[PDB]
């Protein structure tokens, strides 16, 4: 009967909480929610919803301050805590950097902006200061040259979650070891350091720096970078070097804009994600390939969570799914309610009366055992619509 | 064969010096910077050197028309247009390890950013800013306590070598060039720092703020200020105040302690004027108690007087001994080339006390050096009629 307060948001809060509920069923869990948590699952899960849907008490921070014999774990919590208000000193935080670097804000952007090759997540003690307390455990993260800030945020969430899981016992049982943070290389960025109201690309900068600006500001659900009004989804560095002043527009067609920089010219790729989603209903890979400038655009998602592979499956675009998956697409990709490819494919099967592509999907690793966020399999769904015939067909592949 | 040297400071002067020694063949032409006052300062006036050594001063427009020359920029203040030349032998010394830190304030920015290294780079000039192909380069290690001025001087010293070690190949067309890498290329325009409006930022880590101090410590432009008080470096404390970053925890006459994001910082009031005044007559024990940042012992006033210089003029042998034990240059010079030995002779002359000289010489005093009029200490004594001091000082030469 230990107690834990989980304060925070997003898949990290939700996933730590379920690990706790799966593996530590006699703990008392209390929750604090971020101010801007809407109760609606988005590109991240709502932690507030998860808690309402799993009878987890939501409390205030003032309540939390009073609870005794509780550990306090912050997972992307929106508040600077006052440690001395607590009874105890068992206050912890995952921070999304390799501390002591990159204390504070926008750790998905700054390391990219500054040109880093790596970052990390850090488990540490909460003291009065911002991401300043003693370090318990850390993990280095490689940032790939092609990765955006959104790509990086996902690795923080994913790696942060495992870091917590792999140490939380020691937090609960006071087995853990801490070490004050170094002086050397400590760095911090406040909220003023980037104005997300007033983004503008700075072209009086190197090709490296401009691509890094792009990468760092590519996070579609907040924004994409813009050039003369029009959204951009990555780019590349050309071998030419224009005599025109940095920022000068050398060329502009339907796919791309070419620009002078301090050094090498760059091409900026027009965001054509919407066009591509639309095209993934019926078009073959030959066609989709011609639209593809940055390869990673194939794994983007609209507001519903629809990726290309998802829209493909819904329309029964089997050969397109073969190619998407060959390019890296998740065969069991999910929307923002956890609806799998298989579930989308099921509606196709049912509308069309054609079940013959299921084998070939299965052969690509499609998993029918998966549950959406209300714990329903694709089978449960066939039961509730009364399509027992298809349910029995699909069962053959288990 | 002809060479156009366009630039300023001891880099331009000493390169020119070396050429007039080792390459008596060459016709030299100079271009000077707009803020070369004609008068020696902490750096030698190149304009002055060219007037005193029969080198015609010309404009950049003139330099475009000179055939059969190479063009060598050594902190030249202008963006040149390669295409207006009759040839392509266009070279520059840039004060960074290219391709990082193109552009401006390269003695500030690597420090601000926390770099342990920088360097100098010989490269071809093309239309862009520090963008052309690399011919040679040298890493410079930035010691943890070196200021921007320390870094600047090393840039001057190391770029001087790098030119001398390579200039024949530039005059003979036997040099190799390699295009600059895309990756890590970085650049800072003049707008990136407003030197008329410098403001210490304590919403930062201790590391960052010391580095701000170091970066803006370049005395003959400016020192950083806290409440109109000039500051000469500082240190990082083990305490971590709870007060908001930038709160003054302590004030006295030697120092100011401030809260940061992480560790508290000690800021040292500038007491160089005081210290220089104490150097005339006080002993090492007094002077050591006045010192906070050790490198303040090497600072110079407007005349080019350091501590060891003031000590030598006033006959303070014990203090010289110690100054040197702490790393001071036994042969330090003012801005006219006048050496320690030349100040100490003045003292020997006026006091009649000749006693300290032997020890000084064992510590390194070099009587053979010449000022910027090509006078040794002996030439002055000879003119003076001081036969006895002439003889006596000559007895100690090694
Ligand atoms: C606000 C915002 C963020 N982003 C990117 C950069 C961020 O690193 C990433 C995540 O944004 P975010 O609002 O989740 O917050 P971050 O600023 O990453 O994390 C801070 O805020 C959290 C709530 C915690 O207090 C955390 N300990 C803080 O360091 O999204 C945008 O692209 N556009 C935006 O407008
Ligand atoms: C992918 C896709 C979906 N849709 C439809 C199907 C859904 O009924 C509706 C909402 O999409 P959504 O991703 O929010 O779906 P969800 O509500 O998450 O999933 C429901 O619909 C699926 C098709 C399965 O039947 C599942 N069993 C349902 O619970 O939009 C399209 O019209 N075009 C599309 O390209
Ligand atoms: C202007 C200025 C400079 N500084 C420091 C920072 C600089 O790195 C250092 C030297 O100043 P600086 O004006 O000589 O030039 P920097 O900005 O170093 O060098 C650029 O300007 C030169 C004239 C050349 O064109 C060179 N190619 C450029 O790199 O002094 C101050 O501390 N306060 C100041 O107000
Ligand atoms: C270092 C120092 C110098 N002085 C004086 C000595 C000079 O007469 C005057 C100008 O200083 P400076 O460094 O510009 O001297 P310079 O003009 O460089 O050198 C002359 O004066 C020296 C003392 C030697 O005789 C030398 N051989 C001369 O060429 O200031 C002081 O009063 N207090 C001092 O602490
Ligand atoms: N005590 C304390 N509280 C914490 C942590 C800590 O390690 N110490 N760790 C987590 C970090 N949480 C944050 C960090 C920063 C903000 C934030 O909002 N920062 C603004 C604050 C500006 C301001 O304070 O005015 C900024 O840095 O620009 C919000 C939650 C959770 N709470
Ligand atoms: N061609 C060209 N000319 C050169 C070099 C070069 O490699 N290419 N190498 C040297 C670098 N000299 C400089 C570099 C920048 C400035 C300067 O003043 N820059 C302002 C820009 C002024 C402007 O363009 O508006 C800035 O960078 O913010 C002055 C001399 C000298 N001449
Ligand atoms: Na902001
Ligand atoms: Na260009
Ligand atoms: Na400026
Ligand atoms: Na503090």
PDB file of C-alpha atoms and ligand atoms in Angstrom, chain A residues 128-129, chain B residues 240-245 259-264, ligand 10:
ATOM      1  CA  UNK A 128      13.153  24.533  -6.279  1.00  0.00           C
ATOM      2  CA  UNK A 129      14.798  25.098  -9.652  1.00  0.00           C
TER       3      UNK A 129
ATOM      4  CA  UNK B 240      21.912  27.290  -5.128  1.00  0.00           C
ATOM      5  CA  UNK B 241      19.764  30.181  -3.983  1.00  0.00           C
ATOM      6  CA  UNK B 242      16.005  29.894  -4.183  1.00  0.00           C
ATOM      7  CA  UNK B 243      15.502  33.511  -5.190  1.00  0.00           C
ATOM      8  CA  UNK B 244      14.593  34.198  -8.753  1.00  0.00           C
ATOM      9  CA  UNK B 245      17.450  34.136 -11.265  1.00  0.00           C
ATOM     10  CA  UNK B 259      21.219  33.595  -8.083  1.00  0.00           C
ATOM     11  CA  UNK B 260      21.047  31.756 -11.385  1.00  0.00           C
ATOM     12  CA  UNK B 261      18.917  28.962 -12.797  1.00  0.00           C
ATOM     13  CA  UNK B 262      21.245  26.511 -11.060  1.00  0.00           C
ATOM     14  CA  UNK B 263      24.377  27.397  -9.139  1.00  0.00           C
ATOM     15  CA  UNK B 264      24.991  30.826  -7.591  1.00  0.00           C
TER      16      UNK B 264
HETATM   17 NA1  LIG C  10      18.934  29.842  -8.179  1.00  0.00          NA
END
